[PDB]
Design a protein around this ligand. Structure first.
Ligand SMILES: O=C1CO[C@H](CO)[C@@H](O)[C@@H]1O
Lengths: 439, 439, 439
């Protein structure tokens, strides 16, 4: 039954950059709750000031390794400091520093584990996440010979000069002048995983190289927070109240939240879709809340539509989670026009608070959304999005209470416990995997 | 101690071409009797109609894979249908039909395992039997990386085109235009086994290639089934009753139960042996029952002797295992004049039920039969076979009850439990093996 | 754990050549006491009666293998005879003969393990000691695929011709014309160990080749025997009684217990130091007892000093093991001027009995002797040894009583039990090791 897991993560709470830190801490906590002893190795990034445990040679220079320690139940956390690991720029400083930081983290992890084997047994598996932890996972695999699992949360698609592999003591893994560290991590790993079944299919051109040892393991949502119990009144009352705060009157309400960028979150597709619809008679029946920032040309374009249309509103700030929870619980639909999506947490967050997703049929959004829980659409096509929005409006005159209930039931099925239980399977190879010849 | 075993066989009761089906069923039940969890994959051959579990691409076409499930204690059987696996011709249709049936068995077996691994732990070993299951054994070894034991029940000694290894997804196993699948099986296996010590010596020219990881595991005999307790009355009473059934009076009885072919079970040597004795005076004081079929020329020749003499009978139709038991318990002797013999399951069936075997001194028959439990003869020689039959008629006057009693006691020592116990040793490597330098 | 251990050693009590025989027996019994099943294979060296267990081919010749069996609780000892294994010359006969004997031990060990695996499980680890057993270790690892651990007690630093590896069935381990068998033993080993941290450091030029899988495991000492409890009277009484036997007065007594012709114990350093001290006034307070025998030139030098000084005593006759215990337990200081010392059992024997060691700072003597337990000197320097002896007379202020108490505490902590436990960590790989980048 019970196992001893070594989890290598390049970021961990309270260090927060993207969504990974939160994701790895949830996995690590969930594993611990199942009764597994979980050890976490992660850089301190200048957040913690630990005790000096030893010295290592890295890039022809001496470096004193420091360690900060926390223990919560079966979870044991180690923040490793020393050299570039004390640099606050989590993914830095610069492309050069980040790679050196990853290499130092690799040799520091071997030092720390080596000291632990002085008083305790070898871990059953080494679970390492993303290309930044590859040097650590490769080194631990190389010397201690324990099973390795590699999880890719998002493909970076970029090669590193052979130089950095030679310095990490992994020369044999660098037979060419440049190496993709995600290909190297998949090569040395026993089982490779990714965060959705759809993303695995979308990026098969790459994942194909690990046919028969590549699988999917879904992330989870904490619908202990994302939940309607924190909201008061009925949905209509909440929706009428929210719209008053925005300075709009009653209408079918659509919501976008995300970065304003190109070929990514698709706010540009949404904006063109609003322009297409603006000539239709049923446009003045629709309400649009667009939240986020980034590309200032897209922010200006977004602010032009707010200026030209009283039923469109834009907010270029990062709102709190409490305020976003109330937004998901008030709006009718959430629009997710992504060009690609590894998982799609925004969908789950909206679905748990009863908002109906209209999303691009890409990556994990295909796995999350179904016929009876939302609308999928062809990605990168404003006309087809505008048409999906028109179809969402006719639905709205019917009782959508069944749609909303199905969303809440489904979203809550994506638990972190289910996610953890399935990693335990991957750790022993007792798991299914992707084969090209299965139809 | 206890292990999850995945057993791959091409033949399984109630499907029955030769003694292979009975061998694989008994092994599987014996493994299960010892407390081990045994999963059997085997083709349906059109005898079982099952539920679809998915689809696979094989030879550029979509093939629907179906499964029929039977649970019987710790033994779990999966008859796999789809494409040529639905063909009623077990070892066909023809040479190429059998090969692509074997390739289909490979990818279908991966699909089923992949699906089982979605809700259960990975098996500790894969035990695959004869060259027909090599595609399945190799694929499961390649991807799932579990220990593999290859057991050869009969050596076919031929090569398949590389085309079929390419189509099976095993290009790295076919570096020439034509490939012996028995060499491939041995190569990729951790421990190779055959069904007797005598056959290992006889075919050392081949087995020599896997020196250091090659051994023998004797087949057994289900003396709980093959027993005189199911029969009633005395032996002479059953003997007289059976002889009168085919329209013959009392007299010493010899039996043959084997497939009609040129250089295998030796029906050609028996028929010519009968022609030598027909000129002699003792022929009228002898009875013959020649059960089997196959080759048209030999079928006509066996049929011709039946027409000439009211002394010889021939049965071509499918006899039950219950009726074959009754024949063994009635007849005085059993002739087993094979050119080669991997084991000799007919020998132990005859001996356990009381009949005295007359066998060729080849392969497993040397291990089974001794001077105190039967008559050994030079293989491929009709003269010495005829000579041994006359020596059998000399003993028929003497109460040879010790032959019958020593046969019973000797046959009982070859239990399937011992065979099962010894296969468990093979699965972990804890078994003795043949070395080139060990004389 | 309760693992099953197969231990390989070229000598084993009662066959004594160096210290290896006693050191392996103590390791084996300690493991047996901790509840592990231990199997020892060792050559008979023409000493013990055995029964034949089969034949092997070596060097184009047929050899009859013989075995003697001894059982002692959980310890099971197999002394393997046959061919050159019947040679009484332990490390012979001659250099070529010794290599052939070592090769014969390889194929004979494979034959014995092969027969044992007919009726018992495969051992969990193969633990082989020094280069003489590398043909056995490598062959067992090759065929049976079980975890290997290679312990170096002493480095011989020579290369053997490729011929011998080809005859041992290990052609793949000899791609060059000449091969260092100590390199070969580490390469094929999963974890390599050596008998001290200090000797690991001294020979890092060699051990660095197995960086990441090389570690140390100290030898031990039997403080059930080397104990003051057996000695009657106080230490003062014993020393005075000792000095009157040898015909001297009271004084600070120094002792040397080592074989002269064993150059590696620097008795010539001591003798020169005594000459340096003889011109000093405080020499008349010193008493010396040199024990051992060897070179006529060196014995003459010792017996010359014995003649010139009533201070000095030279004993060449073979002493009792009980008597040597009483010497350690009544002298003040023991001098160990070794040029090198992988462990330093003599220092522990003195310390466990209260004698304060004055020793060369080489190999395991650095690990055994601390500032609170004894005196470390620069190796091979008579002048620095003379100073150490002078400094010792100052400590003879009566506060060397705490030195003796510290020595007994420290000596006892080097038990064979603690050594056996750390080897068990080595067999699983759950142990700290030496890395190149850990400074
Ligand atoms: O000689 C034989 C060879 O194959 C089978 C074993 O799989 C036996 O049943 C048969 O008697």
């Amino acid at each position: 039954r019970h196992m001893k897991v070594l989890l290598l993560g390049f970021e961990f709470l309270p260090v927060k950059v993207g969504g990974l830190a939160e994701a790895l801490t949830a996995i690590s906590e969930a594993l611990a709750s199942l009764g597994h002893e979980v050890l976490v190795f992660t850089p301190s990034h200048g957040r913690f000031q630990g005790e000096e445990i030893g010295k290592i040679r890295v890039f022809g220079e001496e470096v004193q390794v420091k360690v900060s320690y926390e223990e919560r139940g079966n979870l044991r956390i180690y923040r490793i400091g020393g050299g570039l690991l004390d640099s606050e720029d989590v993914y830095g400083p610069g492309w050069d520093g980040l790679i050196r930081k990853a290499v130092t983290f690799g040799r520091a992890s071997v030092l720390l584990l080596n000291d632990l084997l002085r008083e305790e047994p070898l871990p059953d598996v080494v679970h390492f996440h993303d290309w930044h932890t590859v040097f650590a996972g490769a080194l631990i695999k190389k010397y201690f010979k324990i099973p390795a699992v590699f999880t890719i949360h998002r493909l970076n698609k970029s090669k590193l000069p052979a130089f950095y592999f030679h310095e990490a003591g992994l020369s044999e893994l660098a037979p060419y002048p440049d190496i993709d560290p995600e290909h190297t991590g998949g090569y040395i790993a026993d089982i490779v995983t990714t965060v959705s079944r759809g993303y695995l299919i979308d990026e098969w051109g790459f994942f194909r190289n690990f046919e028969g040892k590549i699988t999917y393991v879904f992330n989870g949502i904490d619908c202990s927070f994302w939940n309607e119990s924190y909201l008061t009144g009925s949905r209509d009352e909440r929706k009428k109240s929210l719209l008053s705060k925005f300075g709009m009157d009653e209408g079918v309400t659509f919501m976008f939240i995300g970065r304003f960028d190109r070929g990514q979150k698709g706010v540009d597709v949404l904006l063109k879709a609003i322009e297409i619809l603006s000539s239709k008679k049923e446009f003045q029946e629709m309400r649009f809340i667009i939240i986020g920032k980034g590309d200032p040309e897209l922010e200006g374009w977004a602010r032009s539509l707010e200026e030209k249309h009283g039923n469109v509103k834009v907010i270029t700030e990062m709102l709190s989670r409490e305020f976003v929870r109330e937004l998901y619980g008030s709006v009718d639909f959430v629009i997710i026009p992504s060009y690609f999506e590894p998982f799609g947490l925004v969908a789950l967050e909206a679905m748990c608070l009863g908002a109906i997703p209209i999303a691009s049929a890409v990556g994990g959004l295909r796995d999350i959304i179904t016929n009876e829980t939302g609308i999928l659409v062809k990605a990168g096509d404003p006309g087809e999005l505008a048409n999906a929005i028109l179809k969402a409006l006719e639905l709205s005159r019917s009782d959508l209470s069944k749609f909303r209930e199905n969303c809440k039931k489904r979203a809550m099925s994506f638990s972190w416990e289910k996610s953890a239980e399935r990693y335990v399977k991957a750790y022993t190879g007792s798991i299914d995997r992707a084969f090209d010849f299965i139809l």
